[PDB]
Design a binder for this molecule. Structure first.
Ligand code: NO4
Ligand code: MG
Lengths: 214, 777, 238, 45
């Protein structure tokens, strides 16, 4: 079911101009932090809940490395979605992170693309809420909720407009090119879509559970 | 951060319900995780005054609730009674976990969701007034979640500024009165570093360190999560929560000489207030004198310079520490204090003098002392620069996608504390305030416009792009691989990329596993060198739940760390794995359930390779976790792309498994691109011929086939083995093989002379090469 | 130059795509054939003697004059094409438009149904050393049709078919919610001899029934062990 | 082969915003000739 939801989210972007991109899961420090407008010892590190091996080699907390390498080698326009599994100390989950960099985009276009993404995924007429939040690689940054369960607001994805330093550090002029990005946890979408309440079943791999999605 | 809503509304009262107040904060970027009352709701009970007791060790007593006759309550509360003012339930049952005739119980200190049993009130006993109103128990505790960019919002002053801007009010900032200097016994402060561009110190002598703690300051700190200790630490904690500037008081009798704010000496020892002894580094700022070290600058004080109950003279610190000189040092020693986190995100550098006056006035009110002059150690031009930021109206239009009124842009920025001057026409020069550490570029200011104007006012639009047909070469897609494997009867599994090192060594005892530095458990410590180390537990999971048949396949990554001298030598290759336990087909009336053999499993793997136009050759595999006789290495162009075979029976039995069949293949080889070329078809019939062999048992059938196809020539179209015999009439050590030979000519009918010439050539080669006896059917 | 357009995510519901149907039928060992939409009226009459096929007004030949009421009228000549050229085993599948024209009073009553055809003659699996090649029985063919249906989450009940070109004892009608969506079973052995086809296995399925949308719903799993029981009935074979 | 070529030509467009559209093969004169400003297999008139 995690791969089914992953294919459902990607096909919206796949047949609409975006190309699926993947990368390694064991990353270093630059492509995961220093290239995302994180100076280093910033409070956005949290070395506790991030699996690491040395001091400059760790497991992915998000699929940011593929988006970084795509900007450093390729030149805008860039239209990609980056699925894949990531890791944190709590432990393994998937999340899809799209990236769009063109000659010009805006916060208005990010909100519209995200709204009909949530509407056409869940196949409902959802009530979405845009809250302001913080991410070192976006400004303005936002977090989107949907009125799920019984009138509750549940976070589904974060987004924002790519920070100028993130474009400038990868060789893209932040004055000639604009860009936005987002990131949604796949297990969050899969549970709200299929009505699952314990995501530990996603990786226990009980054949009776998997058969329910066949 | 927790703050009492009543304390917040003394700074700004928006005249709206408490629910909308939190939704305002949440919609301003400061998400409220919880808004609950200080205490849980219960019926109207009043703290009463006890009149008399009746001995009888329980203890019968009489309590006066200020209404009619004093009630008779029997209790066994060992606290001070017979004249005390303690809470007591008149009549009812409303406790969260509870409920002269005995009518009620002398209410205890606990069991009221906010806490010696039966604690009497201090003084000022109300006669009949609800205890929830006397202790302000109906106040709300707002649990704010502040992102690291809003370092100013870590206090009542920071939150009140946010509520005032969204409601278009002006904060009721409490006018602080400065304390004049009566004595002149100040200390000397020298700044040896650059991480403290503003240090303020004041000397106060003869303070009552052992008596105060007002009820209003105790509750304001308790509802923010801070408990009470001494009086000076409570004063410094209150001014921390009120204004945002942390402070600390030292024992003046334990500071010998000039006060130095410097970088710590290499491995300089220091015992902190939590009795923890740490050895610092030349990277962490320290507050020292001319001999020893007193405190880790802005994180935690030392046990030596702490203000104890034997303290008479006190030196008050009120400094601004640069965030880049404090970030990470607290966590380095396993510390997360209120002063450390606020300094890391950014404290308003114009607050030391204001917080010094606040704590001094508070100290003089709650304690006595002679206040000396404030020693100002300030290195200007090193303070946080708040240079003006250019901001055009065309920038906010293109970055937001919609047009916000220029009246709102200037007004919203001004209420947030910015000095915006309309340069020329249509353009602005915005000077950020001193408390905002997140305004530097014009993108920060446009986010402020969207924050104040509203994220619900962001208009909907769609991005435009040029439709260009991207490059694509025909290949075996990942979605088509899942469909093929699913048709073969396998369920997709997703196992953890890290597995147990014991199972990783059980499979391959000569493995060099990539192990985690902070694994979540022992069974999730080593990154899987093979997908089997993480799929076998899932196979055992189902088997431990009455599941005879389980067939998995996973498309993940394995981590090849063998013969690697460093971490960058790691090879993370995507693989397709297959695990099968049980019968090949589900139980039906067609046959009794029986597990697969090597040829049932090979037939499935061959079709997966055939689905991607992959031409392979099989050789015996040497994987330690495989049956040596029934294992195969899958070779493409001589190099291995994977393997298949039976799990080693000794390993198969150690894990309590039935006949298991495992296989792994590199995704790069299976999901390959391909190109097909058309070759002409003959208009003329083919000629079928059979060949029966009697060959040694240790000659592979494939070796015989490629020798027949080689010596056969161009006229030989196809060959395929159609029978193997190993019964009566075959000497032990040999076997009977029967090959079919399809002959084809491109442009004519084959003559019987050519075929017999080819057959005699093939039998002569097979007779001489392998010493075999042949026939020609 | 290049045209421009807005990036709009189109509505899409999870379904069995046509590409995933081909990959399943190809995994089951069938080759995709593409035969003419018109076939011979005589072969169309042989399969169903009560057929009223849509006839072309100017066909190029007599064997390409009747719009196929079933994909067999055009696939069988392709099977006979291979069988006559030293091919013991040929397995086809086509997608797949047939033209229902019976019980129609006008050409606007014509029904053009996209269908999935299956034609298999010879052994199930190619000739190997594991066993002597033998043609499939009914349950080998039903086991392949049951998987194509299961690949689209289609719940199906089987009943005896009464189509003329089918063996009446070994031919099923595939029903969902009581209505038929196709059939499966071997050709009538009399038609096999008239066409020189040995033993053939035919099946046709409406694409709208196979390529249908689906929705998964999660149900809780019991955490305690189940119990297995056996019952042995001695019942009549009817 | 033509199915593979067909799915290759179409995937260039489907991945770029275009959508696949199919329809019946027995057509009328309006949708095949009259609506387009205008040796054919016909049935009736
Ligand atoms: C963005 C990224 C960071 C990767 N995560 C995506 C994300 C974006 C916004 C909110 C939440 C998550 C890579 C470089 C270009 C800009
Ligand atoms: Mg900001």
């Amino acid at each position: 079911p995690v791969t089914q939801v992953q294919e459902r989210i990607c096909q919206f972007f796949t047949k609409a101009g975006f190309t699926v991109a993947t990368g390694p899961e064991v990353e270093d420090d630059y492509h995961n932090f220093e290239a995302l407008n994180i100076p280093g010892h910033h409070p956005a590190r949290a070395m506790h809940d991030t699996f690491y091996f040395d001091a400059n080699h760790l497991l992915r907390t998000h699929t940011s490395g593929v988006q970084i390498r795509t900007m450093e080698t390729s030149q805008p326009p860039i239209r990609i979605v980056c699925p894949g599994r990531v890791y944190r100390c709590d432990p393994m989950f998937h999340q899809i992170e799209g990236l769009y960099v063109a000659e010009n985009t805006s916060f208005a276009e990010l909100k519209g693309l995200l709204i009909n993404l949530l509407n056409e995924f869940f196949e409902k007429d959802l009530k979405v809420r845009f809250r302001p939040s913080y991410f070192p690689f976006t400004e303005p940054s936002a977090e989107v909720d949907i009125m799920d369960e019984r009138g509750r607001w549940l976070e589904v994805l974060g987004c924002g407009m790519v920070h100028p330093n993130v474009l400038r550090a990868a060789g893209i002029d932040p004055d000639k090119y604009k860009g936005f990005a987002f990131g949604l946890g796949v297990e969050r979408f899969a549970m709200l879509r299929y009505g699952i309440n314990d995501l530990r079943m996603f990786y226990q791999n009980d054949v009776r559970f998997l058969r329910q999605f066949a | 951060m927790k703050i009492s809503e009543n304390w917040l509304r003394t700074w700004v009262n928006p005249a709206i319900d408490s629910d909308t107040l939190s939704d305002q904060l949440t919609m301003l970027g400061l998400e409220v995780d919880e808004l609950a009352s200080v205490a849980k709701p219960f019926t109207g009970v009043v703290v009463g005054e006890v009149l008399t007791v009746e001995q009888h060790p329980l203890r019968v007593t009489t309590v006066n609730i200020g209404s009619g006759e004093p009630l008779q309550i029997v209790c066994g509360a060992p606290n001070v009674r017979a004249g005390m003012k303690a809470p007591v339930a008149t009549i009812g049952a409303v406790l969260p976990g509870d409920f002269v005739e005995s009518q009620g119980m002398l209410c205890g200190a606990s069991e009221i969701d906010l806490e010696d049993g039966l604690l009497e009130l201090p003084a000022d006993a109300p006669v009949g007034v609800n205890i929830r109103e006397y202790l302000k128990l109906d106040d709300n505790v707002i649990d704010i979640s502040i992102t690291p960019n809003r370092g100013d919002c870590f206090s009542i002053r920071g939150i009140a500024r946010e509520v005032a801007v969204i409601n278009q009010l002006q904060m009721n900032e409490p006018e602080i009165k400065s304390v004049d200097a009566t004595i002149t016994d100040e200390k000397k402060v020298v700044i040896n570093t650059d991480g403290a561009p503003r240090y303020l110190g004041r000397v106060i002598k003869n303070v009552n360190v052992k008596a105060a703690t007002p009820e209003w300051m105790e509750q304001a700190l308790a509802r923010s999560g801070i408990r009470t200790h001494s009086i000076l630490v409570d004063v410094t904690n209150y001014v921390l929560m009120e204004l945002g500037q942390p402070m600390h008081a030292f024992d003046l009798a334990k500071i010998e000489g000039t006060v130095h704010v410097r970088q710590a000496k290499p491995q300089e020892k220091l015992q902190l207030l939590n009795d923890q002894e740490v050895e610092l580094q030349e990277d962490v700022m320290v507050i020292a004198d001319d001999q020893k070290a007193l405190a880790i600058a802005g994180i935690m004080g030392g046990l030596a310079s702490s203000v104890t109950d034997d303290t008479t003279d006190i030196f008050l610190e009120s400094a601004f520490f640069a965030p880049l000189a404090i970030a990470g040092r607290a966590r380095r020693f396993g510390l997360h204090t209120d002063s450390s986190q606020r300094y890391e995100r950014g404290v308003d550098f114009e607050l030391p003098v204001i917080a010094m006056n606040r704590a001094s006035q508070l100290i003089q009110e709650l304690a006595g002392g002679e206040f000396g002059p404030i020693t100002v150690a300030e290195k200007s031009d090193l303070l946080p620069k708040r240079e003006a930021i250019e901001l055009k109206q065309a920038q906010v239009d293109q970055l937001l996608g919609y047009k916000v009124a220029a009246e709102f842009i200037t007004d919203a920025l001004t209420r947030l504390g910015c000095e915006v001057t309309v340069q020329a026409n249509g353009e602005w020069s915005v000077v950020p305030p001193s408390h905002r550490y997140d305004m530097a570029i014009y993108q920060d200011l446009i986010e402020e416009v969207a924050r104040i104007d509203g994220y619900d006012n962001i208009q909907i639009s769609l991005p435009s792009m040029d439709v260009q047909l991207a490059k694509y070469q025909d290949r075996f897609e990942i979605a088509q691989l899942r469909q093929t494997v699913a048709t073969l009867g396998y369920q997709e599994a997703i196992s953890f990329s890290f597995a147990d090192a014991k199972l990783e060594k059980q499979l391959n005892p000569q493995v060099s596993p990539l192990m985690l530095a902070n694994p979540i458990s022992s069974d999730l410590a080593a990154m899987r060198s093979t997908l089997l180390s993480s799929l076998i537990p899932c196979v055992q999971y189902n088997l431990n739940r009455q599941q005879s048949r389980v067939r998995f396949f996973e498309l993940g990554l394995r981590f090849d760390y063998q013969n690697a001298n460093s971490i960058q030598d790691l090879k993370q290759i995507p693989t397709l794995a297959l695990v099968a336990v049980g019968s090949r087909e589900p139980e039906s009336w067609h046959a009794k359930p029986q597990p697969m053999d090597f040829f049932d499993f090979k037939g499935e793997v061959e079709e997966i390779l055939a689905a991607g136009r992959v031409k392979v050759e099989y050789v015996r595999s040497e994987r330690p976790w495989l049956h040596p006789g029934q294992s195969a290495e899958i070779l493409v162009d001589g190099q291995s792309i994977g393997y298949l075979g039976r799990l080693h029976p000794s390993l198969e039995n150690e894990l309590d498994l039935s006949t298991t069949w495992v296989a792994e293949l590199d995704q790069a080889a299976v999901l390959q691109s391909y190109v097909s070329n058309f070759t002409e078809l003959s208009r003329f019939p083919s000629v079928r011929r059979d060949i029966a062999l009697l060959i040694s048992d240790n000659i592979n059938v494939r070796d015989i086939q490629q020798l027949i196809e080689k010596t056969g020539g161009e006229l030989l179209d196809s060959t395929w083995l159609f029978d193997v015999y190993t019964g009566q009439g075959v000497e032990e050590g040999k076997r009977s093989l029967a090959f079919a030979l399809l002959w084809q000519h491109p442009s004519r009918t084959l003559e019987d002379a050519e075929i017999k010439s080819g057959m005699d050539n093939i039998i002569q080669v097979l007779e001489n090469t392998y010493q075999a006896t042949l026939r020609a059917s």
